Each structure stands twice: as structure tokens, then as C-alpha cells.
Design a protein around this ligand. Structure first.
Ligand SMILES: CCc1cc(Cc2ccc(CC(N)=O)cc2)nc(-c2cccc(Cl)c2)n1
Ligand SMILES: [Cl-]
Ligand SMILES: [Mg+2]
Ligand SMILES: [Zn+2]
Ligand SMILES: [Zn+2]
Length: 335
């Protein structure tokens, strides 16, 4: 077990890590094992004086607060986004750009960004007058909740991984993490992208030059959003598993809607689904525009990511056997 797990974890710096195999091999602890590997590799325990027992205790706690029964928004997704961010952070164009604290912020934000996800959308929560939507005034409901939980868990026994940061570091990290996780609200996508394009238009290189907090945080926001929307850029055997999981989750929401006598939301009706066509639409309207812009920012570092993305689009287009794609996109990715 241990040797096989270690062998898989050798790919932690690679796009296309076998994250589902890691989940199986670790006894459903992919987030804990991947985070621990990354913190060791980046020397973050030493830099920030994080006790190893504290790190593991926090990670296990965090991982426990992802719902294993939610098909997509679970601990495997969190582990995937962490690992993807870890790879993006090492892209040559960004070499030496970010401080260790910024790195820690991006990785921690990735780890917590979907914690305690119930497997239904912000719009479902709002439309049902849910407790969470009442608590958060309909505004980035889940994302505010993920932050609140991810930070609160630091307060459990032997969980405060930031205990040896300075006051200023802790404040800065908290501000960056909030900014990053709030940017994972899918409704902010079009604004984030528009703003990234504008950044790319005026970029300075020596390797990217980022002079101010605003530019740095913008890049980290987009980096983690790209990681969150990275599934179609992965090896096809991985991508297809992510598709199958998100559709299962969506169809479960639709089943809840049906039981409540609600109109079934776009993409959530197992009786009227077009999985392949819907992925093509996702790539054409959302994922390709985003990744083409990231690739411009880090040119030429992300070329292989784009090539894969285009191959995968073709595969889905080729296996096709409306209002829905269009309605889903409008309701999901616009403010
Ligand atoms: C490849 C797995 C995957 C991931 C995502 C990303 C995503 C994550 C979360 C949400 C919000 C929500 N409803 O929970 C919406 C989209 N979207 C999709 C998808 C699936 C069908 C159609 C479209 Cl346009 C997109 N497919
Ligand atoms: Cl795998
Ligand atoms: Mg989310
Ligand atoms: Zn708890
Ligand atoms: Zn996510």
C-alpha cells in the first residue's frame, strides 16, 4: 500500500496526477496526503514553523468536512484543485514572482475552497430560501460558507497551522484567501476573465513582472479559478470521470427539485440530458476562453494544456449520439 501510494505521489508536480488512484490508496484521504506532500516539497512547514502533527490534524479535520457522498464537490475535487494550483504556481513565467506567504495563501485557499459543499448550487439555496442563503443574504452563499468553515476549523484541537505566522502575515494571508475563494463563485467568471484579459494586454516581462498587490492577487484569483475549471484540460480518462461525477451531482439536485414540485434546473434533469453536447458548450464558451487567456499570460508555458483541451473537445464532439446549455451558462457564469 505505502510503496504504491508513494510511487503515485512522485507525479505530484505533473498535470495529470492519478488523483482517483491516490484517493483509493490513501483510504479516501487524497486531500491530506496531497497537501502534506506539497507542504513538504515547498518547505512550507519550515518557513512558517508549522508543526507536522498540527498540519496533519488540520488536514484530516478539513478533509472530514468535505462530504464524501457528494459526487463532485468532495475531498477528491479539493485535492485536485490543490494539486492543480501547485502545478500552476511552478510555471516558468511565474518563477520567483510570489512570496512564500502568497504561495501558502493560494494552496490553502484551494484546499478549503469547496469545504462543506452540500452538492446543490447557490441558486438552489437561494430559490429554496435555505438557511445558508438567509445567513449570507443571497450573495456568494456557498463561497462565504466555505471560507467560514475553512477558517473556523483552525480553532479545533491542535489545528492552528498559522499559529507561528506574525500578526501581519496572518492578516495578509486571511485577506488573500478570502479574495481567492470569493473569486471561485462561478457567477464572477465573466468579470474575472474580462479583468484578466485587460491585465494580459498590459503585461510586462523580464518571466512576468507583478508590481502591486492588485496585480498579484488578480493572478492568484485567476490561477485558482483556472484550477477549479481545469478538468477538461486533463488527460481524457480523468476528465471523463469528472464529467460523470458532476452530472451525477447535478441530477441529484434535479431529483430534489422534482420532489419539491420545482421546475427542474438546466443540466439537472436526468430524463432530458445531453452530456457530450453540454461539455462541448462548457469548453467553447467558458473553459477554452479562460485557458487561452491564461496561456497568453504565461506564454508559452500552457501550450500543452490548450492542446489537450482541444483534443478533449473533439472527443466529446465526436461522441454526441440548447435552451439547456445556454440557460445553464447564463445562470451560472454571469453576475
Ligand atoms: C467537467 C466537470 C464540470 C465542471 C463544471 C464546473 C462547475 C462547478 C460548479 C458549478 C456550480 C454548481 N452548480 O455547483 C458549475 C460548474 N462544469 C461542468 C459543466 C457541465 C455541464 C455543462 C456545463 Cl456549461 C458545465 N462540468
Ligand atoms: Cl486516477
Ligand atoms: Mg465552489
Ligand atoms: Zn465539524
Ligand atoms: Zn471547486
Amino acid at each position: 500500500q505505502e510503496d504504491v501510494l508513494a510511487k503515485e505521489l512522485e507525479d505530484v508536480n505533473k498535470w495529470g496526477l492519478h488523483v482517483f488512484r491516490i484517493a483509493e490508496l490513501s483510504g479516501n484521504r487524497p486531500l491530506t496526503v496531497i497537501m502534506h506532500t506539497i507542504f513538504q516539497e515547498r518547505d512550507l512547514l519550515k518557513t512558517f514553523k508549522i508543526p507536522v502533527d498540527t498540519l496533519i490534524t488540520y488536514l484530516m479535520t478539513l478533509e472530514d468536512h468535505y462530504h464524501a457522498d457528494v459526487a463532485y464537490h468532495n475531498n477528491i475535487h479539493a485535492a485536485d484543485v490543490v494539486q492543480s494550483t501547485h502545478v500552476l504556481l511552478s510555471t516558468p513565467a511565474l518563477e520567483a514572482v510570489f512570496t512564500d506567504l502568497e504561495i501558502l495563501a493560494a494552496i490553502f485557499a484551494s484546499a478549503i475552497h469547496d469545504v462543506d459543499h452540500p452538492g446543490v448550487s447557490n441558486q438552489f439555496l437561494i430559490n429554496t430560501n435555505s438557511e445558508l442563503a438567509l445567513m449570507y443574504n443571497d450573495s456568494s452563499v456557498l463561497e462565504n460558507h466555505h471560507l467560514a468553515v475553512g477558517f473556523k476549523l483552525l480553532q479545533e484541537e491542535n489545528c492552528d497551522i498559522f499559529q507561528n505566522l506574525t500578526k501581519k502575515q496572518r492578516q495578509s494571508l486571511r485577506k488573500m484567501v478570502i479574495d481567492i475563494v470569493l473569486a471561485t463563485d462561478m457567477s464572477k467568471h465573466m468579470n474575472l476573465l474580462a479583468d484578466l484579459k485587460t491585465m494580459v494586454e498590459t503585461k510586462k516581462v523580464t518571466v512576468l513582472l507583478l508590481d502591486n498587490y492588485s496585480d498579484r492577487i488578480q493572478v492568484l484569483q485567476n490561477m485558482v479559478h483556472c484550477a477549479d475549471l481545469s478538468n477538461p484540460t486533463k488527460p481524457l480518462q480523468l476528465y471523463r470521470q469528472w464529467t460523470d461525477r458532476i452530472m451525477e451531482e447535478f441530477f441529484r439536485q434535479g431529483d430534489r427539485e422534482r420532489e419539491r414540485g420545482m421546475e427542474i434546473s438546466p443540466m439537472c434533469d436526468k430524463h432530458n440530458a445531453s452530456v457530450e453536447k453540454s461539455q462541448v458548450g462548457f469548453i467553447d464558451y467558458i473553459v477554452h476562453p479562460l485557458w487561452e487567456t491564461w496561456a497568453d499570460l504565461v506564454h508559452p508555458d500552457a501550450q500543452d494544456i490548450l492542446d489537450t483541451l482541444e483534443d478533449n473537445r473533439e472527443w466529446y464532439q465526436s461522441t454526441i449520439p440548447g435552451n439547456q446549455v445556454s440557460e445553464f451558462i447564463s445562470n451560472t457564469f454571469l453576475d
